[PDB]
Amino acid sequence: PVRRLPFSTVSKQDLAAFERIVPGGVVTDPEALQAPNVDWLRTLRGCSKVLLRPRTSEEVSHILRHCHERNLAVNPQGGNTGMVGGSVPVFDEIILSTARMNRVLSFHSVSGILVCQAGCVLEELSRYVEERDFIMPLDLGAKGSCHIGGNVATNAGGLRFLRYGSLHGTVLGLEVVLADGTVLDCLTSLRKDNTGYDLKQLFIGSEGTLGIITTVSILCPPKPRAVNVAFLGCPGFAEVLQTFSTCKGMLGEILSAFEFMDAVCMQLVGRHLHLASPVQESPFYVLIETSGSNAGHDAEKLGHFLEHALGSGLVTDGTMATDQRKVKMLWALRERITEALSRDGYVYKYDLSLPVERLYDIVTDLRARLGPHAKHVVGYGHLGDGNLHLNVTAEAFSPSLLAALEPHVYEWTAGQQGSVSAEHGVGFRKRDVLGYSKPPGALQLMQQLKALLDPKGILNPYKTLPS
Amino acid sequence: VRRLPFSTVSKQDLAAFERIVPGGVVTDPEALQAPNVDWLRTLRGCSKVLLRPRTSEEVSHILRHCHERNLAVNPQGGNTGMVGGSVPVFDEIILSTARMNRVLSFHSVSGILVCQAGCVLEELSRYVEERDFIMPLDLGAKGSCHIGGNVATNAGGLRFLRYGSLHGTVLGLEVVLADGTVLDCLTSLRKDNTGYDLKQLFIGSEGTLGIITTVSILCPPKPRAVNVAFLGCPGFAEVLQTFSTCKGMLGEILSAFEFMDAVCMQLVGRHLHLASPVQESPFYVLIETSGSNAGHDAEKLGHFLEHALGSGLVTDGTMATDQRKVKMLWALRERITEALSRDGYVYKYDLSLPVERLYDIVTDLRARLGPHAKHVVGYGHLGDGNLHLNVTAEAFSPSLLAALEPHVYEWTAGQQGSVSAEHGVGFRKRDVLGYSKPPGALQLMQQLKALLDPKGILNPYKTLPS
């Protein structure tokens, strides 16, 4: 298995130092510590004996200063919604939670620049800015629990990535605490600033291996005056792809989301979540969202788009909604897919970037490769961004079924020059499969960067670079 | 200011470079004069060797040799940079990407373009536009600037408001490191979270951490309808409300929002002989839209102009959907920088400030600078809070520089602004980062610099504090 690196252990003196550093922010009770040690998928559990919950950036700096001198490994944790085992300890690394770093520092109603602490939950940030007629540039099904610091640390994609793009573009500045406790202030709240290297980009997608994000500056797009969502049934994946091409051609700049899900996904969300399908039974379903400034113009685009899609046979049945209650219910069919799979049994999860034309080929293949040993096999995700979420469910974990999935799925993906982790990141699960998507020379530079910023390696060990 | 202890180019080095790049070794000093002079014509190197490699392997092999010999190398693209970064300070080897001008691939569905770093931006725009796509950036230097130079400086530009930074639109880079190591981050995927986003280090590194040789970039679709509204505003307060209503009334179709003052219009008319199409106003704004339905776009701006002219935000205006007239309106703005360098000596500052206070420094400097400056102008990317502040003088005067500096840099810091929003640092601003970056940030930049280029052969005297 994996072996524990020669870190120190948490002593009584360390617990006393943490109570001094974070008064009332030291949890050592083993039953309370059980939940933060187990990941969201509940397939990994650490043996951490202390979870620290600082309130301020200075406290985070001082904690790591103490941990750097004492050589104690630290596992930063936000909402603990990560999918790659990066959010929980492997052995006894101190859990540093951002749960109390949940304050908004400022929001400028003209520029739409938000400055807030890393532990602010994304949905509450969305409600804050939408009260001021702006929106967050990303949204995910984990919005209710995931923290913005975790989102930046994982470079979270999400459901509006098609419209607003990466956090690499939307993060304007970061405050980061490094492994030795130096608070690196790169918290520029400016749209444009070319005064040296864009150091904050290193920490976007680094997953707490190069430093702990404590404050985030984010560009909030304006809240759209008109939001429409269309939910369509397609008779095949070829029609889904041409529907997407027609979608870009006819809706254009107002398109804010394009998601797909197969029939089995719809069945699972119907079975486990009791959500009736709003369309005719189809092999594939598509969720399109539009955001724009003129409701009348957006209605014309979508109407003419829909007229052509049904007329040319790309869509068999579809429905549309503008009412906020109904719009959210259609989104629920997509956002809650992840919940229904993990409740269906053991989930074999694969998050792949592939050529959009070949996005679903692996799902048909794995249904053929995997006999009755797979309970269900589903494919869905962000088709507009080339993102497939490949999931296999079974009654329980099987080494035989794992051997059929791996390395086959990773070799398939590499054959398409694709990404084995499009969005969710590397963490513990995918640390040894980066060669499928990254060349050795790139991986070495990541290691040299790690040694520069965290030479003792106390920040998220066993993560997220190869051994 | 003083030359670092690099080796000097020997006769054996020129023979070695001829083996590596046959026919790519230019040593004629008169031909070497133009690449030695920056675009602003205020920095001049004394380099005796210009190298024009064709392939990434030729760049790797040149730098392995340069790494062995500790010879300084000055990467160069279109030589349109504004911060003295693109020319040697002393005798650095100029490595031009002029011949690295091949498109490697373009997928007509995803719109992802992979091309060599030396491809000129305007030529690439024509190429992807022949396939109904566009570059995610465009600059006034489009006719000369290289995509490798654009990525190395993290160029913002005139459509930054719509498509954003190269940090978002660049998908992958192949970079040759100081020791010749070829770093392959040339992924053509929209989303890829397999480790650190190493390419981001080189976006804005200005050739100090490596030489970008191949670029992968997401090209947005070419819009079906481009409209340009050129309006005259009676004050900067009216400019700001024209911008605010614009976002509310045009919204997602908005692709550019530029502003310029009256003095800017006078210099482009005087030096470039371009006539204004609207009545004389103290401020002009250029609004561009890009959308998929030409009809919906036309209706959105018509309602916007009717309200803008109705509410007194605009006094006179013109509009064009014709490709010819759209370029004529755009020509008045893109080459203002050309019209400024032709007015005399130009003191140039590229500032990010709160948009509401963006022009306050222009009024301040005009009051502070009496008759001792020729003109003080303010223009640039108002949508991005990016002010191009320029002061002209009949000749350079150390008096006028002492009046402007550090005052201009201190003013911006008082606003928590950027002392180089767009153009970068280079040679001129290497010692002005304290106004925008704290010491801990600047310290880490040197640590990354020491890791990626321990000998410091790549772009010496750049772009970090001394």
Ligand SMILES: Cc1cc2nc3c(=O)[nH]c(=O)nc-3n(C[C@H](O)[C@H](O)[C@H](O)COP(=O)(O)OP(=O)(O)OC[C@H]3O[C@@H](n4cnc5c(N)ncnc54)[C@H](O)[C@@H]3O)c2cc1C
């Ligand atoms: C229902 C559901 C839907 C999801 N949908 C999406 C989706 O659409 N797109 C997508 O990309 N992902 C998605 N995810 C996974 C995604 O990675 C997480 O939801 C989220 O982005 C991580 O935030 P978090 O606060 O939960 O971080 P955690 O899970 O707590 O941590 C994840 C990693 O980040 C590190 N980290 C956390 N906080 C910090 C910090 N302050 N500083 C430094 N490092 C830190 C941790 O050490 C760990 O390595 C989904 C997950 C769920 C459960």
Ligand SMILES: Cc1cc2nc3c(=O)[nH]c(=O)nc-3n(C[C@H](O)[C@H](O)[C@H](O)COP(=O)(O)OP(=O)(O)OC[C@H]3O[C@@H](n4cnc5c(N)ncnc54)[C@H](O)[C@@H]3O)c2cc1C
């Ligand atoms: C008329 C005009 C308008 C402009 N408008 C804008 C604008 O709107 N926005 C904006 O941001 N800038 C603007 N610029 C300046 C802009 O920074 C440059 O024009 C351009 O982005 C750089 O390309 P280049 O080929 O000229 O690079 P160069 O000038 O040759 O070099 C620029 C710097 O990057 C380095 N470099 C160049 N190529 C490479 C490479 N392949 N690999 C590594 N390092 C490299 C050089 O060493 C140097 O430090 C304008 C310039 C002009 C003359």
Ligand SMILES: O=C(O)CC[C@H](O)C(=O)O
């Ligand atoms: O699909 C999954 O199981 C993981 C979450 C995914 O990012 C989503 O888009 O919902």
Ligand SMILES: O=C(O)CC[C@H](O)C(=O)O
């Ligand atoms: O204006 C300047 O001094 C330099 C060029 C500038 O980036 C522009 O937007 O035209």
Ligand SMILES: [Zn+2]
């Ligand atoms: Zn997803």
Ligand SMILES: [Zn+2]
């Ligand atoms: Zn500019």
